[PDB]
Nucleic acid binder design. Structure first.
Ligand code: MG
Lengths: 532, 380
DNA sequence: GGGGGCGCCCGAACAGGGAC
DNA sequence: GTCCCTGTTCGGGCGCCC
């Protein structure tokens, strides 16, 4: 192929590989053909370099060390084309190039490093892009791009989705003219040395493309088969999760969180039976026939989110009701402590950034949160936070802050002065309080931290107080967490605190500087630091 | 023209920053713009054999913007007057930088990738053949020319000051409303710094004080003791002896009542003894005050504020982005450096949207803060 | 016993602030 | 500094694509 070569070097101070090794009769079969067609060349013992080979009718070379010594490349594949980004076309063809890499010449000054040797119980060089070499994918994609350009310029109103060596070509032409143009594209590729085998030329729907089934008006995924094991290794769940993540692009309401959390510090894992539920529910959903549609720029893009439960979210992007382009999910646990409004913000961000990639614009949102709640949270939150143009959609469970913190102290309510102290060598602590109505309490903790004792202190106060309470704390830490109004935490203690907060009618929390001989903060400190 | 050889710094390679997702209109615009820079020889197509990348985008006429922040950190290494003049104007003089070829040995470091809607196509990579708009070394190379280009204007008008920051040229004059505006125009053919007021610290004034009110007072004053040495909380703290309810009313003593007046006294003057060090890093901290109001302080060592202020005005992202540029602008005019910001926003929230509001030539460095709900109480 | 990309999840390693 | 804790990036497993 008349493609000009891409110049490639090793890294400045390094040398080629020198590694050494009955699939041998399989390998001589292949290599002899490859030489006949010029893909390789035999070399003599003068060439110092060698890299291992193996076969699995298919030959591949382990170029790990070569790759390590090869220059860095800027990868030109920035993502995966998605079906929901496809515009509706009258005529469509899917195409594949055969022997992609091997139709593309390597850098003559570099070929000597690709040296390999079929073993004894014959040495070669690569003349084209080897498979397993680090630079081949980028060099192919870049080359395919430059090869396709003259045709792209010539046929500006023909869409070619170009993924490695796979080609989707769509046009607004009638099936005859279109087939002519495909042929012209096929001839163009041959002149540049690229074969498109008829055996991989798809001329009628459904088109198999990029994992999908492309019909004329709708698209879908190719069948998904979940692994149904008796025992579950850590990997089987990772496999199962990934398969479920892939399904969630078009099957609505896929859930992964509970399956997900079974992997922590982790061999076989008992399915927590919260997991087998969501699995079983998932299995039910994959019995559903679902489909997506194609993209119309003359319409609005609309995302719509719902809460699946426990920081688990589902969305749908559509232009017309009941016909959604794509679906998806969000279930990331970001932060040690969080709440539903935070996560909805995060869900909005994921969808936004996903839409920019697929459609080149941001959707209009439909969210299950009242304009009020949002403005309330946006008020009480100290760091910047935002959501684009959105409608409220009455679709339970709505999104809410589960408790609120008073802005002013509660008159008459008991005032707790809480504090905690921990010794770093012994890891022994004390948490407790001193109140206006005369009450006093100190508990001791084993195996704790100073930040933990301050959380205990506050927890103490909420257990012992009545439905209303003012708390004064000298802890920047604890106040930071609680003023953010979490409803979920990694911390059991913060969770316990949360159940309490939900129960109060009113909580007011206030901060004071430590060690300034101030209020009962000195009193409770002395009780609590004693022994620490 | 002679190209001036440039290098990076010892033990440091070129930028390798991934391109980020772009709106269709920004891509469309960029692709339109890039072609003619290619057609005119200012940039030439490259491939993956070039291992470097710097992000690109477009702000709106569109204007190509290249985030050369990483390259700027990696490339080899001021009028007090401008800060003083009643009217200062800002010009876009980047296009000048294209008139100077760049050391071909260095061009590989200027590489960028145009992205593609729905990944229809791999990225299309380009390199710079001339001094790139927005790069640190561009002003350094084009300065000897620049001095020459406008010296007539400078000697024709000695009471007009001109300062250059990257693609930006700051031109300041004391002339009246309309004649500032017209001696600008013969520069294009060839914002006032003294309206910037320090935002003081203020204490609440009220007729009756509760335990809570005092606690909040003693907390704020305690913190202010770091910036202001003289401040005292001694008399106030003792009003809080014993464990009182928060709503209780506390009559102020004689001694506390004017310890407060004396505390109000200190905060009533300017902070002393803070001097800008060009060698040291310049920091800006921003806080959200609600109200559509934002407080900021610029400093080099903690509590040594070169300046404090307030940006006031709802879109939290847009407002913070707008605060960042207003603050940055100021810091150039006054010191000729941009500061590393500490931003009260989650990284991903900010990264999602800040480029839809940016309208400047430069980009400051920033990191993100997990901020105290406290320092909000300190600048009210 | 091979390569490149994107996504999702984890723990590990590191940065940074508060409190000693 | 330390410890603690919270945040982020990184690398590895899986998914999918070629
Ligand atoms: Mg204490």
């Amino acid at each position: 192929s008349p493609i000009e070569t891409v110049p490639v070097k090793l890294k400045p101070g390094m040398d080629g590989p020198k590694v050494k090794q009955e699939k041998i009769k399989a390998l001589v079969e292949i290599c002899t053909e490859m030489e006949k067609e010029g893909k390789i060349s035999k070399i003599g013992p003068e060439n110092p370099y060698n890299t291992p080979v193996f076969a699995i009718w298919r030959k591949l070379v382990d170029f790990r060390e070569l790759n390590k010594r090869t220059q860095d490349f800027w990868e030109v594949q920035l993502g995966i084309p998605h079906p929901a980004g496809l515009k509706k076309k009258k005529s469509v063809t899917v195409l594949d190039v055969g022997d992609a890499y091997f139709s593309v010449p390597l850098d003559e000054d570099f070929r000597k490093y690709t040296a390999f040797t079929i073993p004894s119980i014959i040495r070669y060089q690569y003349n084209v892009l080897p498979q397993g070499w680090k630079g081949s994918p980028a060099i192919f994609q870049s080359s395919m791009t430059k090869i396709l350009e003259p045709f792209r310029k010539q046929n500006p109103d023909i869409v070619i989705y170009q993924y490695v060596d796979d080609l989707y070509v769509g046009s607004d032409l009638e099936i005859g003219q279109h087939r002519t143009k495909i042929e012209e594209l096929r001839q163009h590729l041959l002149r540049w040395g690229l074969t498109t085998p008829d055996k991989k030329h798809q001329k009628e729907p459904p088109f198999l493309w990029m994992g999908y089934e492309l019909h004329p008006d709708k698209w879908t995924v190719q069948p998904i088969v979940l692994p149904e094991k008796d025992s579950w290794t850590v990997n089987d769940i990772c496999k199962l999760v990934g398969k479920l993540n892939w399904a969630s692009q078009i099957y609505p309401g896929i859930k992964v969180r509970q399956l997900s959390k079974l992997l922590r510090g982790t061999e076989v894992i008992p399915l927590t039976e919260e997991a087998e539920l969501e699995l079983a529910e998932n299995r039910e959903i994959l019995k559903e026939p679902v489909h997506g549609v194609y993209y119309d720029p003359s319409k609005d893009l609309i995302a719509e989110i719902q809460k699946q439960g426990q920081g688990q979210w589902t969305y749908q992007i559509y232009q017309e009701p009941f016909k959604n382009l794509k679906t998806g999910k969000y279930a990331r646990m970001r932060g040690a402590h969080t709440n539903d409004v935070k996560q909805l913000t995060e869900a909005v961000q994921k969808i936004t950034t996903e839409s920019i990639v697929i459609w080149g614009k941001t959707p209009k949102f439909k969210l299950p949160i009242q304009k009020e709640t949002w403005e309330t949270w946006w008020t009480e939150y100290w760091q910047a936070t935002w959501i684009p143009e959105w409608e409220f959609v009455n679709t339970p469970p709505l999104v809410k802050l589960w408790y609120q913190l008073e802005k002013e102290p509660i008159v008459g309510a008991e005032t707790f002065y809480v504090d905690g102290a921990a010794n770093r060598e012994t890891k022994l602590g004390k948490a407790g309080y001193v109140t206006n109505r005369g009450r006093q309490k100190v508990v001791t903790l084993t195996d704790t931290t100073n930040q933990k004792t301050e959380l205990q202190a506050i927890y103490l106060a909420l257990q012992d107080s009545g439905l209303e309470v003012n708390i004064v704390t000298d802890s920047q830490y604890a106040l930071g967490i609680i003023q953010a109004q979490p409803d979920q935490s990694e911390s059991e203690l913060v969770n316990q605190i949360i159940e309490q907060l939900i129960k109060k009618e009113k909580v007011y929390l206030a901060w004071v500087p430590a060690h300034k001989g101030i209020g009962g903060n000195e009193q409770v400190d002395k009780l609590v630091s004693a022994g620490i | 023209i002679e190209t001036v050889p440039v290098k990076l710094k010892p033990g440091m390679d070129g930028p390798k920053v991934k391109q980020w997702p772009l709106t269709e209109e920004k891509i469309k615009a960029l692709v339109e713009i890039c072609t003619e820079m290619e057609k005119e020889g200012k940039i030439s197509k490259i491939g993956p054999e070039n291992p470097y990348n710097t992000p690109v985008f477009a702000i709106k006429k569109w204007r190509k913007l290249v985030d050369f922040r990483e390259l700027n950190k990696r490339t080899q290494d001021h009028p007090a007057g401008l800060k003083k003049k009643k009217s200062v104007t800002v010009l876009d003089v980047g296009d000048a930088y294209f008139s100077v070829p760049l050391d071909e040995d260095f061009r590989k470091y200027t590489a960028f990738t145009i992205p593609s809607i729905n990944n229809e196509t791999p990225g299309i990579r380009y390199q710079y053949n001339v001094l790139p708009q927005g790069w640190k070394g561009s002003p350094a190379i084009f300065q000897s020319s620049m001095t020459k280009i406008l010296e007539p204007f400078r000697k024709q008008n000695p009471d007009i000051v001109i300062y250059q920051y990257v693609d930006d040229l700051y031109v300041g004059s004391d002339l009246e409303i309309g004649q500032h505006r017209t001696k600008i125009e013969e520069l294009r053919q060839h914002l006032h710094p003294d309206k910037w007021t320090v935002q003081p610290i203020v204490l609440p004034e009220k007729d009756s004080w509760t335990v809570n009110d005092i606690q909040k007072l003693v907390g704020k004053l305690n913190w202010a003791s770091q910036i202001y040495p003289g401040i005292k909380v001694r008399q106030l703290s003792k009003l809080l002896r014993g464990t009182k309810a928060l709503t209780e009313v506390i009559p102020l003593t004689e001694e506390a009542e004017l310890e407060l007046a004396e505390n109000r006294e200190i905060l009533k003057e300017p902070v002393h003894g803070v001097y800008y060090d060009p060698s040291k890093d310049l920091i800006a901290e921003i806080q959200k005050q609600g109200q559509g109001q934002w407080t900021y302080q610029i400093y080099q060592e903690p509590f040594k504020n070169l300046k404090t202020g307030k940006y006031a005005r709802t879109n939290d992202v847009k407002q913070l982005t707008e605060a960042v540029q207003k603050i940055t602008t100021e810091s150039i005019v006054i010191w000729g450096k941009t500061p590393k910001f500490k931003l009260p926003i989650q990284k991903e929230t900010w990264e999602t949207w800040w480029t839809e509001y940016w309208q400047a030539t430069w980009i400051p460095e920033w990191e993100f803060v997990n901020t105290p709900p406290l320092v909000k109480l300190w600048y009210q």
